[PDB]
Design a protein around this nucleic acid. Structure first.
Ligand code: SF4
Lengths: 1124, 132, 26, 374
DNA sequence: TTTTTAGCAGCAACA
DNA sequence: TGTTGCTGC
């Protein structure tokens, strides 16, 4: 009894500090034009149909943030607004959460207890009712009784949580206190709460009124915000990374709405730069006006002044969360400028740069999450090449600081190139994508850009659960340990997507392949043909057979081709190279089977349900494959390890505690299990000679069909809206071509909206495929590890069923989860058109429709139940299935690599070519990667196009082998040819270090050796350009890595370091060719030749086309045993 | 300041001579683009004299030391350029999207003369190989 | 005598457009 | 095969210029007076343009990172035989080419509006005996004839004559000049009074009859309305074509409205009705024209919705934000067709007017009108 | 403190 | 020869 007075004072102090920060934000917002608009009083009848008589002001909500108002919690909403430059408005709303009771008869005893226990922080209390999908018989309208606790602000809500958590912990471990079951909805972010509970969304238009925000629909197009995009050039030391403590800003390049600007620091930049044009395409203009400023502080002041003048509501950068803004802010602090009081920008709790009025659109966040680019193509140049379809200017980072004095015009051309690349990357891709996501997600642009996709699914599901009055579950907490057969689980999961590599080789539309058709598969297909064609009209094309004039003509044409393939079942003819892939596979399995985490019921919850009668159809049973990884050790051995650890002593992790040492039982239970797992890994390895066992167990779960439909309705509805936009897209495509060609005739509004619907299409797309993932989002809500296993095993069963047909009528090459790559005979029944009485043609792909018909006969849900009458709880039962293959192709060529191991393919690696010879799709491979060995990139650039040459598979591999031999001649001749500097570059291998410093005092290797050798010779991001030296003989490759910059150095310096690095004091020859390890480079290229060519042909049984690169000994044995 | 482009001679020669048939114009012109830097000696008169007579790799023509730096063999669209003893370049004859034009600024008389107009170019985009 | 070669640039680069002055020509 | 040789020294005079299809058509035209000409205002600062006889392109050099060698065919002065090296696929040598130039850039041509360089051209206000005044000032620059001016201007002949006529260029006593706004419109006013006083066909005017009509009863030494002045007024306020002039009547009325704004209502915001009455009364009798304060405001600004006041576009800032600031200052709330000619000067980016409008100032609508505030 | 999932290639170490 | 780690698909 001795601290009750010191907690109240700190919360008033924190609320005053938050009000003082809110005042500073109001001052900054007003400077930037975001004056706080308060709408006129209106005592009239509220109807949203008469909005134009409705009072206040209409605007599009561009930016929203949580604030504390004179403190009361509120959200400020920033409206790019129509017409106006901008204006903010505030919605106040009480933060709240719920208490759950175990006995609904004594809720009033809990009410009196919590009124009296929370009196210091509670604003108001109310008893409410919500649907809880974990409650027995909620499907009869039974609702859980809940105590709503409301607060004046989010700080008082947090104190109520601190007071209640001890009672929940006492109740769980060990009176009206024991009637408190749990707290619910206590962890929803406050701005997300206001956005959901008021249905306000960024990217949407609203009228701000006294009653709240009213959404507007007469306006689907976005407003045009003022968009700034910037980049910065800094000094740096040779071979190191710029340090904001010592290095200066040389230049800041930027674009505002399509005008270009450059600020230069004339302490560093040697000449005055004149106004110039950088237009890399006619669709990307860049006129640059130049501000030649005297010093770094004038450069910073000009940059902050120009931001205040143009009032950008978006600032975009490339990686500026982690370089640009950190640098500007540290340089500003060295010069005594406060960047928050100058322009409203500060680092948040994550260290990311944010303001109130202006959203920070780091393009690199979208590149990492949404661009679908592999991590090797996520640097600005490779994004510009892959998205904007030009090469930006490229400068070596080691030449930047020299070129500020020697060639500053060429440094300014580089800097404006990266501003142009960033601005047009933002405007063409990031802008329409993020603001489109905001129209549906209850988040601002900054959070919508930066949160993980499974958190975006969580927000969408929280909107839908709130709208249906469902009670949100608390966030799933993984159990700290689990056991299986008395063994400690290291991890548990399910069997995921099925993947097979069936063949390896070159397959070409102009080279012949052998086919061995199963005549019984053609008999099945001939017997299925009438219903498969009817299914293509009725289900795929949503038409009636009675409207189809040529149905029997198409049937007879397919029947003839099938009969000829039945009689001539062994053929050697040209292939059709096809990809067949399931449209949105996991989402469609989920909608078809009514899979949610709201239904997976136990035998208990199913037995407690009043719909559980004799004859029940609503209990759909589905299989999944669980997979444990556990320690070989048993429960007695686990207990022996625990007793051994209880005799040990542990360091206290809490730096604020004076107690340096803890016992085992004084550790947190998570820390206890970390120490147990460590000693069990050692014990298991010592006693059982293995650390883990893995086991796969087939399990069954009950999918309720009668359970409240909110999850699946979100998926069905979202799927239909996306289809809607694909349709609208097509109608718009017709509109963009039907009309006249005067491009500027008030139809550039029509094309932006085309980008817009495309973007809402891609948006629903990501959201759907994400729901599909979210559901295994550890720590998220609505988690459902099961459901995920059913979805994967059902998918694996569908794709194995499809493969088993394709293997009987053609040859499947690769299978990955939802897709099959195959070759069919060129005589196979392919594409047809049904003719309707109205002259419209419906599309038929027989290889696709034969699979879709079999999917519908085997995987349809005849148990799907939907709630027809919500007053009487009447359910209808129908047949649901949305699982369709799509077809892509035919393709010109496909190339599949083989393993060096006997009988083993290489999965998820292939190259595919279109009929025009363009590269359609690739898998694995290098080159596209940052750094790597330049020889292998140049070899890969040459080789891929040459797979389009030759009329047979052997001819194709022979053309490819010519290029392989030419690249072997360059190495076998010791590259004495060409120029020395060129040899350097190609041989060069480049590697970037993440953060040098102590990560680097840390590990040691080739780059680590190159970075240390650059340090010996001449911070974060360093490009280790190196070659591998022949000397010292028998030394590890990591000690033979020589930096290429030594070859351009003075002969005495070059001699001293080459002698020291080769361990040859007598080294007098300094030619690069006698230093190089040609054997190492010959093995690197030979290993590329094995993976990309020798394997394909030799794996398919064609003789080895590059004999100068031998096959692995397993593959030689596999060929010899295949020919015997 | 201001100055005219004189294009009368090229125009008269163009109208009086047939259309361009191969990659070389009737007046005997060719361009060339290399993805790289052509590393040549900094001096030539001294080095042209030590080249043995049999090779003739550094010849003298009208008082100017010309270096014989390669050979070109055109096979349809394909083209190959041999450089020195150790370089082989594979390339192509491509039709120019924008017909290039070479001109000539006579600083002496402040006259500008149109020299010729291109339509094709010989490009070499792959790393040089030995001549074999 | 055999010291003529091309130092290969790994990728084709086209530089920034520049304005032209009278002195740029002469 | 052809042997490729290189000289020790290249001629840097040879440069590469991109030739667009249109340039090719121009290039293959023997008809033209002037084929093509490089033009620049000065030697060290201004841009360089390429001009045909009727169009102008601005030149932009674009550097590249490659080695580009142009080879010309040559006939070796003495027979030269080369040794065969291990080179495969070599036909007999039949001609010889030498790389004579190494170029690092191309000259791109972008279409732009030609403008006259009016640096040393003085302003003429109709002063008597102006020949004396041209030596009262020290103008070293000499412009005898207009062709010399066009020759030293960055524009084509047709563009030059069009712009020269548009800005009211003339020549007095053998000295090239630019007429003041006041005296030009005064000469127009007297001319129209004489033309309608003699019942001349306003659609078929010639120089001699009108010139005779204007200077009939005034002394020649004090009659500034010379024949060249007549040619300027006709080429400014009429369209020619045996080529005769026909008056641009709506254009004349518009000019007259600009004159009225600059003389009488440039300091006060008069109600539109009184200004239209006085404006109407200033014309020479029976001149056929109707009017709208619509273009009157397309020309000035409106302090309130029913008044008009003159504004000259030349006095407006070139900084966007400042010009928008001063525009919002002239009238807190602005119309539309009223604000469009006021913002034309800020960004040639060809945009939706509303775009830059909001960019600085901001739009706000109501029932039918859209005004502009902040 | 915020955080979708599983299946697979292949380099390199060591059981 | 197999498992295990890590990066990156
Ligand atoms: S199967 Fe039927 S009775 Fe059982 S829980 Fe589901 S809806 Fe209720």
């Amino acid at each position: 009894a001795g601290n009750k007075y010191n907690t109240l004072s700190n919360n008033y102090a924190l609320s005053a500090q938050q009000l003082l920060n809110a005042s500073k934000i109001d001052d900054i917002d007003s400077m930037m034009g975001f004056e706080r608009y308060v709408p006129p009083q209106y005592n009239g009848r509220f109807d949203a149909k008469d909005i134009d008589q409705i009072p206040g002001r209409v605007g599009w909500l561009t930016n929203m943030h949580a604030t504390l108002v004179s403190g009361i919690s509120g959200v400020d909403f920033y409206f790019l607004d129509e017409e106006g430059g901008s204006f903010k408005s505030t919605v106040v709303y009480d933060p709240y959460f719920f208490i759950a009771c175990n006995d609904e008869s004594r809720v009033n005893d809990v009410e009196e207890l919590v009124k009296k226990y929370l009196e210091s922080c509670l604003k108001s209390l109310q008893i409410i009712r919500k649907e809880d999908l974990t409650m027995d018989n909620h499907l009869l309208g039974l609702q859980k009784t809940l105590i709503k606790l409301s607060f004046v602000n989010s700080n008082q809500l947090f104190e109520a949580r601190k007071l209640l958590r001890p009672i929940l912990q006492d109740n769980a471990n060990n009176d009206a206190k024991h009637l408190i079951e749990d707290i619910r909805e206590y962890d929803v972010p406050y701005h997300v709460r206001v956005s959901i509970d008021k249905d306000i969304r960024v990217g949407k238009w609203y009228k701000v009124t006294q009653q709240g925000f009213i959404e507007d629909t007469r306006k689907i197009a976005f407003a045009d915000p003022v968009v700034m995009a910037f980049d910065i050039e800094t000094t740096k030391p040779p071979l190191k990374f710029p340090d904001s403590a010592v290095d200066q800003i040389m230049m800041i390049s930027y674009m505002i709405d399509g005008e270009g600007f450059l600020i230069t620091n004339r302490e560093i930049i040697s000449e005055d730069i004149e106004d110039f044009e950088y237009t890399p395409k006619p669709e990307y203009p860049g006129f640059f006006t130049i501000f030649n400023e005297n010093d770094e502080v004038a450069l910073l002041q000009r940059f902050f002044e120009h931001i205040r003048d143009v009032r950008p509501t978006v600032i975009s950068t490339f990686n500026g969360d982690f370089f640009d803004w950190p640098f500007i802010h540290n340089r500003s602090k060295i010069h005594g400028l406060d960047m928050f009081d100058e322009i409203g920008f500060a680092p948040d709790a994550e260290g990311e740069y944010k303001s109130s009025y202006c959203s920070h659109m780091d393009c690199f966040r979208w590149v990492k999450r949404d661009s679908y680019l592999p991590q090797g193509s996520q640097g600005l140049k490779a994004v510009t090449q892959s998205k904007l379809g030009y090469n930006p200017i490229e400068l070596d980072p080691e030449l930047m600081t020299p070129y500020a004095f020697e060639k500053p015009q060429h440094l300014s051309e580089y800097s404006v190139s990266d501003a142009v690349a960033t601005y047009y990357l933002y405007m063409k891709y990031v802008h329409p994508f993020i603001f489109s996501l905001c129209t549906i997600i209850p988040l601002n642009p900054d959070e919508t850009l930066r949160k993980g996709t499974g958190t975006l699914c969580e927000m969408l599901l929280m909107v839908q659960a709130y709208q249906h009055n469902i009670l949100l579950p608390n966030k799933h907490t993984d159990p700290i340990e689990r056991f299986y057969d008395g063994h400690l689980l290291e991890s548990e999961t399910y069997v995921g997507g099925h993947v097979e590599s069936l063949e390896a080789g070159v397959f070409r539309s102009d080279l012949k392949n052998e086919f061995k058709i199963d005549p019984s598969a053609i008999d099945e297909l001939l017997q299925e043909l009438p219903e498969a064609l009817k299914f293509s009209v009725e289900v795929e094309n949503k038409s009636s057979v009675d409207k189809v004039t040529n149905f029997e003509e198409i049937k007879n044409q397919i029947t003839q081709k099938l009969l000829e393939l039945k009689e001539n079942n062994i053929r050697n003819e040209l292939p059709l190279i096809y990809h067949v892939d399931v449209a949105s596979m996991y989402p469609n399995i989920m909608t078809t089977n009514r899979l949610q985490p709201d239904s997976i019921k136990a035998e208990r919850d199913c037995a407690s349900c009043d719909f559980n009668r004799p004859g029940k159809t609503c209990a759909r049973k589905l299989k999944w494959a669980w997979r444990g990884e556990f320690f070989p050790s048993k429960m007695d051995e686990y207990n022996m390890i625990k007793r051994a650890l209880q005799n040990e002593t542990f360091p206290n992790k809490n730096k604020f505690s004076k107690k340096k040492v803890l016992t085992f039982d004084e550790l947190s239970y998570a820390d206890q299990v970390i120490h147990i797992k460590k000693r069990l890994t050692e014990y298991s390895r010592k006693v059982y000679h293995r650390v883990k066992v893995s086991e796969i167990v087939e399990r069954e779960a009950i999918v309720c069909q009668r359970e409240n439909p909110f999850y699946v309705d979100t998926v069905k509805s979202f799927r239909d809206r996306r289809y809607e936009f694909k349709g609208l897209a097509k109608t718009w495509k017709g509109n963009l071509s039907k009309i006249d060609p005067s491009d500027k005739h008030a139809r550039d509004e029509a094309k932006k909206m085309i980008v817009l619907y495309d973007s809402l299409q891609l948006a629903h797309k990501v959201i759907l495929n994400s729901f599909y993932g979210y559901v295994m989002r550890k720590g998220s809500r609505w988690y459902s590890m099961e459901m995920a296993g059913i979805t994967c095993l059902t998918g694996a069963t569908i794709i194995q069923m499809a493969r088993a047909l394709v293997e009987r009528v053609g040859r499947p090459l690769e299978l990955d989860t939802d897709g099959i790559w195959c070759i069919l005979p060129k005589s196979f029944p392919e594409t047809y058109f049904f003719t309707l009485e109205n002259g419209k043609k419906l599309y038929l792909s027989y290889p696709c429709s034969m699979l879709n018909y079999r999917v519908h006969q085997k995987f349809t849900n005849h148990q799907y139940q939907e709630l027809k009458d919500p007053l009487n709880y009447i359910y209808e039962t129908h047949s649901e299935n949305t699982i369709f293959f799509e077809v892509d192709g035919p393709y010109k060529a496909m190339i599949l690599p083989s393993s060096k191991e006997e009988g083993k393919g290489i999965k998820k690696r292939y190259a595919v070519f279109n009929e025009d010879g363009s590269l359609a799709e690739l898998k694995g491979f290098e080159l596209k990667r940052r750094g790597e060995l330049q020889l292998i990139k140049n070899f890969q650039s040459d080789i891929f196009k040459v797979f389009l040459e030759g009329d047979t598979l052997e001819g194709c591999y022979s053309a490819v082998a010519s290029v392989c031999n030419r690249w072997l001649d360059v190495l076998d001749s010791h590259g004495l040819m060409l120029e020395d500097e060129d040899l350097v570059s190609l041989i060069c291998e480049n590697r970037s270090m993440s953060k040098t410093l102590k990560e680097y005092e840390g590990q040691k290797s080739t780059s680590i050796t190159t970075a240390r050798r650059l340090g010996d010779f001449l911070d974060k991001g360093l490009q280790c350009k190196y070659i591998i030296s022949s000397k010292p003989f028998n030394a590890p490759v990591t000690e033979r890595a020589i930096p290429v910059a030594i070859f351009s150095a003075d002969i005495p310096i070059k001699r001293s370091f080459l002698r020291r690095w080769t361990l040859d004091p007598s080294l007098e020859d300094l030619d690069i060719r006698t230093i190089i390890d040609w054997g190492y480079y010959r093995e690197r290229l030979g290993s590329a030749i094995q993976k990309i060519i020798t394997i394909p042909a030799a794996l398919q049984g064609v003789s080895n086309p590059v004999p100068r690169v031998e096959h692995p000994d397993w593959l030689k044995r596999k060929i010899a045993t295949k020919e015997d | 300041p201001s100055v005219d482009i004189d294009a009368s001679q090229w125009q008269k020669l163009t109208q009086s001579r047939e259309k361009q048939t191969t990659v070389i114009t009737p007046l005997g012109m060719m361009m060339l683009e290399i993805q790289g830097e052509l590393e040549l000696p900094k001096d030539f008169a001294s080095l042209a004299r030590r080249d043995s007579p049999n090779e003739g790799r550094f010849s003298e023509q009208d008082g100017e030391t010309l270096i014989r730096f390669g050979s070109l063999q055109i096979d349809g669209e394909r083209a190959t350029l041999f450089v020195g003893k150790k370089q082989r370049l594979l390339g192509k004859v491509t039709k120019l999207d924008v017909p290039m034009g070479i001109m000539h600024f006579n600083s002496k008389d402040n006259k500008v003369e149109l020299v010729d107009v291109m339509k094709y170019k010989v490009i070499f985009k792959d790393r040089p190989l030995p001549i074999m | 005598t055999v010291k003529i070669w091309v130092k290969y640039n790994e990728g084709f680069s086209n530089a920034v457009r520049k304005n032209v002055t009278w002195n740029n020509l002469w | 095969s052809i042997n490729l040789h290189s000289a020790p020294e290249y001629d840097p005079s040879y440069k590469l210029i991109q030739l667009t299809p249109e340039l090719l058509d121009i290039i293959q035209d023997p008809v033209q007076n002037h084929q093509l000409r490089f033009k620049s205002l000065d030697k060290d600062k201004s841009e360089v343009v390429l001009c045909s006889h009727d169009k102008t392109w601005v030149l932009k050099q674009r550097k590249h990172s490659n080695t580009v060698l142009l080879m010309r065919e040559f006939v070796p002065e003495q027979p030269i035989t080369f040794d065969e090296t291990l080179l495969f696929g070599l036909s007999k040598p039949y001609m010889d080419v030498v790389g004579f130039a190494k170029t690092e850039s191309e000259f791109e041509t972008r279409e732009t509006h030609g403008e006259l360089n009016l640096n040393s051209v003085p302003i003429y206000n109709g002063e008597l005996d102006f020949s004396d005044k041209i030596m009262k000032r020290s103008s070293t620059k000499v412009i005898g004839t207009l062709e010399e001016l066009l020759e030293n201007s960055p524009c084509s002949a047709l563009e030059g004559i069009s712009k020269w006529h548009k800005i009211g260029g003339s020549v007095k006593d053998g000295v090239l000049c630019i007429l003041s706004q006041d005296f030009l419109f005064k000469a127009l006013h007297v001319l129209l009074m004489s033309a309608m006083a003699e019942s001349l066909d306003l659609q078929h005017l010639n120089v001699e009859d009108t010139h005779h009509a204007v200077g009939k009863d005034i002394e020649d030494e004090f009659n500034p309305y010379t024949r060249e002045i007549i040619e300027t007024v006709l080429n400014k306020f009429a369209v020619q074509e045996n080529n005769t002039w026909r008056l641009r009547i709506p254009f004349i009325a518009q000019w007259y409205g600009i004159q009225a704004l600059r003389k009488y209502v440039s300091g006060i915001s008069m109600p539109i009705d009184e200004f239209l009455i006085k404006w109407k009364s200033l014309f020479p009798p029976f001149f056929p024209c109707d009017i709208d304060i619509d273009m009157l405001r397309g020309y000035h600004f409106k302090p309130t919705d029913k008044t008009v006041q003159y504004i000259a576009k030349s006095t407006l800032p070139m900084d966007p934000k400042e010009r928008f600031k001063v525009l919002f200052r002239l009238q807190s709330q602005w119309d539309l067709e009223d604000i469009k000619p006021l913002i034309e000067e800020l960004n040639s980016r060809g945009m939706k007017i509303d775009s830059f409008i909001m960019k600085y100032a901001r739009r706000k609508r109501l029932g039918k009108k859209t005004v502009v505030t902040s």
